[PDB]
Write an enzyme that holds these catalytic residues in place. Structure first.
Site, PDB file in Angstrom:
ATOM      1  N   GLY A 101      -0.907 -14.385 -52.241  1.00 54.16           N
ATOM      2  CA  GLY A 101      -1.158 -13.784 -51.065  1.00 54.16           C
ATOM      3  C   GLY A 101      -1.580 -12.434 -51.371  1.00 54.16           C
ATOM      4  O   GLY A 101      -1.435 -11.565 -52.588  1.00 54.16           O
ATOM      5  N   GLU A 103       2.501 -11.014 -52.839  1.00 54.22           N
ATOM      6  CA  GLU A 103       2.468 -11.085 -54.139  1.00 54.22           C
ATOM      7  C   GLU A 103       1.646 -10.607 -55.660  1.00 54.22           C
ATOM      8  O   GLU A 103       2.273 -10.608 -55.924  1.00 54.22           O
ATOM      9  CB  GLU A 103       2.353 -12.533 -53.926  1.00 54.22           C
ATOM     10  CG  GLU A 103       2.988 -13.560 -53.573  1.00 54.22           C
ATOM     11  CD  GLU A 103       2.755 -13.271 -52.135  1.00 54.22           C
ATOM     12  OE1 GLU A 103       1.670 -13.669 -51.791  1.00 54.22           O
ATOM     13  OE2 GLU A 103       3.815 -13.671 -50.986  1.00 54.22           O
ATOM     14  N   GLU A 157      -0.503 -24.525 -50.600  1.00 49.76           N
ATOM     15  CA  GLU A 157       0.459 -25.018 -51.310  1.00 49.76           C
ATOM     16  C   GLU A 157       1.952 -25.827 -51.593  1.00 49.76           C
ATOM     17  O   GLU A 157       2.762 -25.984 -52.834  1.00 49.76           O
ATOM     18  CB  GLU A 157       1.126 -24.198 -50.675  1.00 49.76           C
ATOM     19  CG  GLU A 157       1.480 -22.645 -50.283  1.00 49.76           C
ATOM     20  CD  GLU A 157      -0.320 -22.522 -49.557  1.00 49.76           C
ATOM     21  OE1 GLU A 157      -0.240 -23.108 -48.634  1.00 49.76           O
ATOM     22  OE2 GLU A 157      -0.252 -20.791 -49.738  1.00 49.76           O
ATOM     23  N   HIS A 171      16.552 -48.628 -47.260  1.00 52.13           N
ATOM     24  CA  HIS A 171      15.078 -48.033 -47.368  1.00 52.13           C
ATOM     25  C   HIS A 171      15.356 -49.056 -45.670  1.00 52.13           C
ATOM     26  O   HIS A 171      15.260 -47.935 -44.991  1.00 52.13           O
ATOM     27  CB  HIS A 171      13.802 -48.397 -48.372  1.00 52.13           C
ATOM     28  CG  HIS A 171      12.543 -47.858 -47.562  1.00 52.13           C
ATOM     29  ND1 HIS A 171      12.912 -46.907 -46.435  1.00 52.13           N
ATOM     30  CD2 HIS A 171      11.294 -47.984 -48.258  1.00 52.13           C
ATOM     31  CE1 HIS A 171      11.541 -47.161 -46.313  1.00 52.13           C
ATOM     32  NE2 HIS A 171      10.730 -47.715 -47.291  1.00 52.13           N
ATOM     33  N   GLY A 197       9.775 -39.971 -50.347  1.00 47.66           N
ATOM     34  CA  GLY A 197       9.205 -40.960 -50.123  1.00 47.66           C
ATOM     35  C   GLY A 197       7.997 -40.447 -48.760  1.00 47.66           C
ATOM     36  O   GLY A 197       6.916 -40.823 -48.363  1.00 47.66           O
TER      37      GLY A 197
HETATM   38  C1  LIG Z   1       4.022 -36.422 -45.212  1.00 52.27           C
HETATM   39  C2  LIG Z   1       4.147 -38.128 -45.103  1.00 52.27           C
HETATM   40  N1  LIG Z   1       3.382 -38.755 -43.489  1.00 52.27           N
HETATM   41  C3  LIG Z   1       3.572 -39.802 -43.856  1.00 52.27           C
HETATM   42  C4  LIG Z   1       4.558 -40.722 -44.211  1.00 52.27           C
HETATM   43  C5  LIG Z   1       4.608 -41.998 -43.620  1.00 52.27           C
HETATM   44  N2  LIG Z   1       3.680 -43.033 -44.553  1.00 52.27           N
HETATM   45  C6  LIG Z   1       4.401 -44.041 -44.948  1.00 52.27           C
HETATM   46  S1  LIG Z   1       3.257 -44.876 -45.983  1.00 52.27           S
HETATM   47  C7  LIG Z   1       2.114 -44.122 -45.325  1.00 52.27           C
HETATM   48  C8  LIG Z   1       0.724 -45.174 -46.144  1.00 52.27           C
HETATM   49  C9  LIG Z   1       0.218 -44.930 -46.696  1.00 52.27           C
HETATM   50  O1  LIG Z   1      -0.804 -45.720 -46.757  1.00 52.27           O
HETATM   51  P1  LIG Z   1      -1.768 -45.797 -48.396  1.00 52.27           P
HETATM   52  O2  LIG Z   1      -1.608 -44.592 -49.012  1.00 52.27           O
HETATM   53  O3  LIG Z   1      -3.234 -46.148 -47.945  1.00 52.27           O
HETATM   54  O4  LIG Z   1      -0.945 -47.293 -48.676  1.00 52.27           O
HETATM   55  P2  LIG Z   1      -0.902 -48.728 -48.113  1.00 52.27           P
HETATM   56  O5  LIG Z   1      -0.060 -48.365 -47.112  1.00 52.27           O
HETATM   57  O6  LIG Z   1      -1.799 -48.653 -47.699  1.00 52.27           O
HETATM   58  O7  LIG Z   1      -0.688 -49.448 -49.095  1.00 52.27           O
HETATM   59  C10 LIG Z   1       2.691 -43.276 -44.155  1.00 52.27           C
HETATM   60  C11 LIG Z   1       1.647 -42.590 -43.290  1.00 52.27           C
HETATM   61  C12 LIG Z   1       5.164 -40.046 -45.072  1.00 52.27           C
HETATM   62  N3  LIG Z   1       5.510 -40.656 -45.847  1.00 52.27           N
HETATM   63  N4  LIG Z   1       4.876 -39.055 -45.432  1.00 52.27           N
END
Ligand SMILES: Cc1ncc(C[n+]2csc(CCOP(=O)(O)OP(=O)(O)O)c2C)c(N)n1
Ligand SMILES: Cc1ncc(C[n+]2csc(CCOP(=O)(O)OP(=O)(O)O)c2C)c(N)n1
Ligand SMILES: Cc1ncc(C[n+]2csc(CCOP(=O)(O)OP(=O)(O)O)c2C)c(N)n1
Ligand SMILES: [Ca+2]
Ligand SMILES: [Ca+2]
Ligand SMILES: [Ca+2]
Ligand SMILES: [Ca+2]
Ligand SMILES: [Ca+2]
Ligand SMILES: [Ca+2]
Ligand SMILES: [Mg+2]
Lengths: 523, 523, 523
Positions: free
Chosen positions: C24, C27, C46, C280, C400
Site C-alpha cells: 500500500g 508502506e 490480506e 466444541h 475454526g
Molecule cells: C470464516 C468462517 N466462516 C464461516 C464458518 C462456519 N462454518 C464452519 S464449517 C463450515 C462448512 C465448511 O464447508 P466445507 O469446507 O465444504 O466442508 P464440509 O462441512 O462440507 O466438509 C462453515 C461455513 C467458519 N467456521 N469460519
C-alpha cells in the site's frame, strides 16, 4: 510560536481562562510561564480537582479545563469522571506524559496506553503523534466536550512537546465556532405540536439537561400552556423546574412499576432532557401501562437508543424547549393545583430529624441559594422541603458516585459568587473528598457545608433492610470529628446538636465571610 | 449450593480470608451472611481500600481480595491500581454490577462496558455471561493474579447472580494448584553460570521482585560468592538487600547516562527482578558503555521485551536466585569494602533537616522496623541513612502515584503485627489518602506516621528548578494542621518542631499501643 | 543511519529474512530499497498474506514477518489472526500509517486508534510516539511474539518515520537474546515425577504446543516409559504424536461428558501443551469422574487460569517434555496394544466416500507428507486413516476460522521444500482464501490441493441435524467449477469423479513440478 504559546492562545480565544489541577513533573513544561490573565485553582487530590471543575462547568454552563499528572493523577480522578459522564459535563481533562524519548522504555511516570485509561468514561480520548499536532488535538478536545451531548474528553501530552514549534497554520483554530443548537425540522415539529395540542391528559417529565441548557423558563411556559403536571425524572442530578410552581409534582421514584403506575391515565407523556429512565431499585412491572404514549426529546443518541419504550427526537434541549413553548396552543383545561405544604415532623430537644434540618434551611436560606445533595438517605425529604425557584439550584452526583458534592460545591460557589452555596452531605460521603476543604479555605470561597452526622451509611442499612440481608459488615462509620477535620484544612467549624444550636449556627454561617462547616447531629 | 456459598468456599480453599472494601448496594448480596471465619476491613475511600490491600499483599507475599462499588468505586481506585501494576501486586479487585435485568437500560449504578474501565492497569478484566459462571470466573481471577508476573485483576459481578444456583461441577475449582515456579533449563543455566564464573569485574543490580519473592538471602549469597558490588535498580518500590552489607552500593540514580557511567568497567552486569531500567529524569547518553555485557533475569515478559539492551531470561525470581546462588563458584577476588557511614549534617535548634530525622529514626527504631517512603524530595538521604537488615523493610509507590504510603502502611502493619511500621510522608503526599487514618484507629493497627512538613511540594520545586521553569503555579501547600486531621480520624497526634521534641515524640510513639501521627517541622 | 536501515539490520540480525505482504502507499517508504538478501512474498488479499506467513511460521518454528496496508489491510486479516491467536503462532504484523503531519485531520488511509484495531487478537499492539523509537518498538514486537506463549503482535508505523535518523544507541537491540526456555524447579519437579511413577493407570493427552516445540520424540519416550495410552486433545490444530504408535489412541471427541467418560478409570491424566479443554459441541456432564486427578503442563497462563479442573504448571513445553521423559522410571506395565487398522468402506464406481480418499492418500503419499485439513465434516475419518509418523505433519485452523488451510499450505511448503504438502479442503472452505492459489503459481510452490466437492456446507447440515433445526437458509454452495478457478490463477487442475480417476490424478499430481489442484466429487 511554540506549542506552549499557541495552546494558551487557543484556550484564551475559546473562552477558557481557568485551569483546575494538581501538578506533576510531566506538567511543569505546560505550567511554566503561566499566563497572567489565567487563574490556577489547586486541589490536593485529583477527585477533588475534577469535582471542583465539574461544579464550575455545570453552574457556568461552559467547559472547564483540567490538568492532572500522568496515569496516577488520571486514575485518582476516574470516579469523578463517572459522575461527569452521566451529567453531560463539558470537561477537558489533560494529563502530562513522559518525554517521547522515554515512552518506549516505560520510564517512571509513563502513562502506558494512555487513551485507553479513561475509557469508557470519555467522549474522546487521545495522545498526539507529534508536538506540532498538539494545538489541533486541543482544539478537537474543546469542541468534542462542548458539542451535544456534552461530556468529558481526555488528552495526553508528552512534556517535551510544549517547547517545540507549532504549525504556523494553527492560527486557523483560534476562532472556530462549532454549533449543535439544532431542533426538529418544521414538518415533523408541526406533527409533534399537533399531538400535544390534541392530548386530553398530558404529563411532562424533565431531566438534568433542561437545567444545563437553562431551558427552565421555557419549560414553565410549556407546562402552563398545556396545563400539565410536571415531574422530575428519577435519580435527578439537577433541578429543572421551580419546586413550588402549581404544576410541580416532585421527584419520581426510581422504579419501573412505580413510574408506570404514576403515569397511568396520562395519554401523552413528554420527557425532555432525561434518560428514559434512570431507574435505581429493581421494581419489576410494566414500563408503561396501556393508553400511555411516551415521547422523548434528548440531546443524547445513547439515551434515545436505549429507551425501552416510546418515540425519541435527538436534538438540542434549549432549541427544542423554546420551539415547543412558543408553538403549543393554550389549553382550556384548568391549571393543576399546587401540592400542599409538607407536614411538620415532631422534633424534641435532642438529635435532629432530617426534615427539621431541611425546613430550617428553607426558612433561613436566601431565596437564590444553591443546594448540593450528598446525604443519600434523605433525598426524598430534601426535594419536598426546599423551595428552589431559580435555575441551577440543585446538584446531586449523577452516577451516584460519592465524593462529588463537597468539591463541586466549591466549584459552583466560584461560578456563582452572588448566590450562597449550601452543601448538605452525609458523614459517610464527607470522607471521599475531604481534602477539598483546603481549596475553599485557600481561595476563600464562601461555601457552607452542612454535615449530617448519624454515624452510619444510612442508605445502605436501608437497602440491607429491604433485601432482608443480615450480617453485612462495614455499615457504620463512628468516631469522626468533622470540626477537627475542618480545622485541619483551615475552615471555620460549628456544631449543632439540637434545633436551637442549628438555628444559631446557620445565622453565624450565613454571616461569615469565608467557608464554614457545620456538623449536625441527626437521628 | 448458591453462587454465594460456592464463591466463599472457593476463596477460603484458596487461602483468602480477608476482604478489603467500601460497600455499596450492588455489593450487599455478596456481603450478606458474611462468613464468620472471614474478616472485613473497611476504608472510607477506594484509593485507601486498595492501598491497604496492596500493602497487605506485598508484605504477606500472597493475594489480597478487594470489593468495591460499581464504576465510581472502581474509578476512585484507579490511581492506586497504577502503583499495583508497577509493583506486580497480586490484587483481586471485584466490583458489584447492577442486576442483569437492568443493565440494558443503564439504571443508576450500572458499570457500563465494565471490563474496559480498569484497563490498561490490569492483567485480566472480565464480567461473567451468567450467574453459574461466577465461581469459575473468580477462580480465573485468583490464578491470573498469582501467576508470575503477579498483578491486579478485575471482576465485575451483577448483584442478582449471588443467590442463583452454582454449577455442581464448580467443586473442581476448590483445590486447583497452579505453579509458575520455574527456572532456566540445565543446559542454558550452565552457560549463564560459566559466564558469571568467568567475569573479571561483575556487578549485580537488584529490583523489587527479589524482595517480593523473598530471594534476598539467596542474592546475598550470590553477591558474596561472586564478590560483587550490589546496586538497587532506580525508582525502587522495595528494598531487596541488607543496606549495610559490605557489597551494598546503594540506590542507582534514575538516569540513562548516570547508570552507564556507574556501570563502566564492569564486564558483566547481572540484573535480577527489575525492569531495565525504571528511569525518571531524562539524562540522555549511552545505555551501556563499551565493554559491558548486561544479563537480565525478570519474571515479566513485558520487561524483557522493552529492555533497550542486553539479554534476558524470563523466569521465577525465587527459583532463579536460588539456583544461581548455589551453582556459582566462590571467586578468589576480595570481598568489596562496606561504604562509609554517612556524615552528620549540622543541626541547629530550629526546624529539622531530613538527614537529622533519618539519623534519629535509625538510632531509635527497632532493628526489624518496616519503613514506607512518600517524602519525595528526601528519598536519596533516606536510602543512605537507614540500616535495613531484613527483607520487606521498605515500600515506595511503584508508579510514583502519591496516596500509597499512608494506607499501605496500615496494610503492612496488619500483615506484620510484630514489626513496627513507620511511614515517612511529605505534607503534600499526606492529603491524597488522608482518610485511611480512620481505618488504623478503628481496628487499632499501631502504625506510626511521620509527616515531614515543609509547606511545599519540594520535589516539584526542585524539578521546576532544573528545567529553569518560572511562574509555575500550585507548588505550595500552606495552612494544614496535621494534628487536627489525625484527631478528626481518632489517631493520637504529636508535634516535633526541633530535635529535642523529635526524640521525645518518637519515644512516646514507639511505646504507644495504637496508631500515632507525628508532625515534624522540616527545613 | 536512518530508521529504514536500522530496522532492516535489526530484522536480519534477529533472523528474519522474508516479508509476507500486500503493499500500500503508507508502506512504500518501508519497502523501497528492499534489501537484496531479503525475500518478499506477495499475496492478493490480506487473509491470504497472513495465512501463508502463519503456515510458514508454524512449520519453521520461528517468527514470520508481515506487512499490511493501514486499517483496511489489517482488517482484512483479522479472521486469520483469530486462528493465529489459538495456535500460538509467532507473527509480527506491521501496518503502514499516514504521515504524522496528517494523522490529526484523518486523511484517507489514516488508521484511527490503530493499536485497538487488532485487539483482542494480539499479545501486544502499539504505535510509536516518534520516528527514533521505531527500531526499539520493532525489537519489542519481535520478542513479544517469540516469548512463550508465542502469539501475534501488531505495530503501526507512520510512513514518514522511515527516512528519519535513528537513535545511534539502537545498535544495542541487534543482538539481544531473550529466553523463556524454563521448567519447573527441582523440588516440585521431583514431586510431579513421583506422582507419575506411582500412578497405576496413567493417561497422556497432548496438544498443539508439543508439535510447536518439536517435543514429539520426548513425548513418545515418556509414553513408552509410563506405558500409557496417548490421546490428542480436542479440536487439534496440529499432530503431536506418531498416529500408528502402539500407545496412540486418537483424537478426543470435543465434549465435556465424552472426555470424562473416556478418561474414567485413569487415576492420573497428564495433559501437555493443550488448553483444558478446547470443547466444541455442548455435551454437559462431569468434567472429570471421581478417581481421576488431572495435571496440566501449559506454556500459557491464560490456559492455566481457565481450566475448570486439575493442577497446572506454566512452563516451556520443550524443556518440560525433555525433563519428564528423562526422569520417569520405566513402568513394569505392559505397553498398550496398537489400535486395529480402520475398516475399508464399500466404494462403488460413483462419487467418492471421504474414507476412500483418505485411504488412497495414505497409500500413495510419501511417508513424510504434510497434510492440512479444512474439510470440516471429515476430520474424524482423516485422523483414523492417515499414518503420520513425523512431527509437523498436520495443520487445522486453530480457532475454526475457515480460509486457513489453502494459504497456510503454501507457507508450509515454502518452509519445508523437501516434504510434499497436501491440503484437503472442502468446497465451501476453498472460497474463503481462493486467491492464495496465485502465490503458489507465481513462486512455483508445489503444494497439492485436494478439493472435496460435495456441494454443501456438510458440517453445518450435520449440526442443523442435531439441533433438529429446520428451514435453515444458506447451507448449499452449488455451481462452483474449481478447475476454472485454478486455471484463473495459473494452477494446473485435475478432476476425480471416481476411484480410478482419483488414483490417476494423484499419480500425476505427485509427479508434477508445480502446484496442482484436484477437484474430487465426494458423496
Ligand atoms: C470464516 C468462517 N466462516 C464461516 C464458518 C462456519 N462454518 C464452519 S464449517 C463450515 C462448512 C465448511 O464447508 P466445507 O469446507 O465444504 O466442508 P464440509 O462441512 O462440507 O466438509 C462453515 C461455513 C467458519 N467456521 N469460519
Ligand atoms: C464512591 C462510592 N463509594 C461507595 C458508594 C456506596 N454508597 C452509596 S450511599 C452510601 C452511604 C452514604 O452515607 P452517608 O453520606 O453518611 O449518608 P446516609 O446514607 O447516612 O444518608 C454508600 C457508601 C458510592 N455510591 N460511591
Ligand atoms: C497522584 C499524584 N498526584 C500528583 C503527583 C505529582 N507529584 C510528584 S512529587 C509531588 C510532591 C509531593 O510533596 P511532598 O509529599 O510534600 O514531599 P516533598 O516533595 O516536599 O518531599 C507531587 C505533587 C503524583 N506523583 N501523584
Ligand atoms: Ca417553613
Ligand atoms: Ca450517614
Ligand atoms: Ca547513628
Ligand atoms: Ca513537602
Ligand atoms: Ca491401505
Ligand atoms: Ca462441502
Ligand atoms: Mg480504561
Amino acid at each position: 510560536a511554540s506549542v506552549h504559546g499557541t495552546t494558551y492562545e487557543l484556550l484564551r480565544r475559546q473562552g477558557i481562562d481557568t485551569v483546575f489541577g494538581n501538578p506533576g513533573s510531566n506538567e511543569l513544561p505546560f505550567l511554566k510561564d503561566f499566563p497572567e490573565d489565567f487563574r490556577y485553582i489547586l486541589a490536593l487530590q485529583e477527585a477533588c480537582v475534577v469535582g471542583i471543575a465539574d461544579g464550575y462547568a455545570q453552574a457556568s454552563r461552559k467547559p472547564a479545563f483540567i490538568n492532572l499528572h500522568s496515569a496516577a493523577g488520571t486514575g485518582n480522578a476516574m470516579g469523578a469522571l463517572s459522575n461527569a459522564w452521566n451529567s453531560h459535563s463539558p470537561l477537558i481533562v489533560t494529563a502530562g506524559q513522559q518525554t517521547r524519548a522515554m515512552i518506549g522504555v516505560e520510564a517512571l511516570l509513563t502513562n502506558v496506553d494512555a487513551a485507553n485509561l479513561p475509557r469508557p468514561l470519555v467522549k474522546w480520548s487521545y495522545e498526539p503523534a507529534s508536538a506540532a499536532e498538539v494545538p489541533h488535538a486541543m482544539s478537537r478536545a474543546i469542541h468534542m466536550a462542548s458539542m451535544a451531548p456534552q461530556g468529558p474528553v481526555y488528552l495526553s501530552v508528552p512534556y517535551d512537546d510544549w517547547d517545540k514549534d507549532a504549525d504556523p497554520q494553527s492560527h486557523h483554530l483560534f476562532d472556530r465556532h462549532v454549533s449543535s443548537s439544532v431542533r426538529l425540522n418544521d414538518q415533523d415539529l408541526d406533527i409533534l405540536v399537533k399531538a400535544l395540542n390534541s392530548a386530553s391528559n398530558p404529563a411532562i417529565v424533565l431531566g438534568p439537561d433542561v437545567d444545563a441548557a437553562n431551558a427552565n423558563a421555557d419549560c414553565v411556559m410549556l407546562a402552563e400552556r398545556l396545563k400539565a403536571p410536571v415531574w422530575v425524572a428519577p435519580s435527578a442530578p439537577r433541578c429543572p423546574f421551580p419546586t413550588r410552581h402549581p404544576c410541580f409534582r416532585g421527584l419520581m421514584p426510581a422504579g419501573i412499576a412505580a413510574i408506570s403506575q404514576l403515569l397511568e391515565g396520562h395519554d401523552v407523556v413528554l420527557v425532555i432532557g432525561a434518560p428514559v429512565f434512570r431507574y435505581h431499585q429493581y421494581d419489576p412491572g410494566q414500563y408503561l401501562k396501556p393508553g400511555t404514549r411516551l415521547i422523548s426529546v434528548t440531546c443524547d443518541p445513547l439515551e434515545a437508543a436505549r429507551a425501552p419504550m416510546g418515540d425519541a427526537i435527538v436534538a438540542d434541549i434549549g432549541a427544542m424547549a423554546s420551539a415547543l413553548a412558543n408553538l403549543v396552543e393554550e389549553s382550556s383545561r384548568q391549571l393543576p393545583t399546587a401540592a400542599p405544604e409538607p407536614a411538620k415532623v415532631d422534633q424534641d430537644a435532642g438529635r435532629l430529624h432530617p426534615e427539621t434540618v431541611f425546613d430550617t434551611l428553607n426558612d433561613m436560606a436566601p431565596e437564590n441559594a444553591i443546594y448540593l445533595n450528598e446525604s443519600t438517605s434523605t433525598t426524598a425529604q430534601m426535594w419536598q422541603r426546599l423551595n428552589m425557584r431559580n435555575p441551577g439550584s440543585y446538584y446531586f452526583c449523577a452516577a451516584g458516585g460519592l465524593g462529588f458534592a463537597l468539591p463541586a460545591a466549591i466549584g459552583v460557589q466560584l461560578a456563582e459568587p452572588e448566590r450562597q452555596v449550601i452543601a448538605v452531605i452525609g458523614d459517610g460521603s464527607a470522607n471521599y473528598s475531604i481534602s477539598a476543604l483546603w481549596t475553599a479555605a485557600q481561595y476563600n470561597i464562601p461555601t457552607i457545608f452542612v454535615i449530617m452526622n448519624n454515624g452510619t451509611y444510612g442508605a445502605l442499612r436501608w437497602f440491607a433492610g429491604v433485601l432482608e440481608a443480615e450480617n453485612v459488615p462495614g455499615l457504620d462509620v463512628p468516631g469522626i470529628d468533622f470540626r477537627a477535620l475542618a480545622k485541619g484544612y483551615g475552615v471555620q467549624a460549628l456544631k449543632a446538636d439540637n434545633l436551637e444550636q442549628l438555628k444559631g449556627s446557620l445565622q453565624e454561617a450565613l454571616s461569615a465571610k469565608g467557608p464554614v462547616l457545620i456538623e449536625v447531629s441527626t437521628v
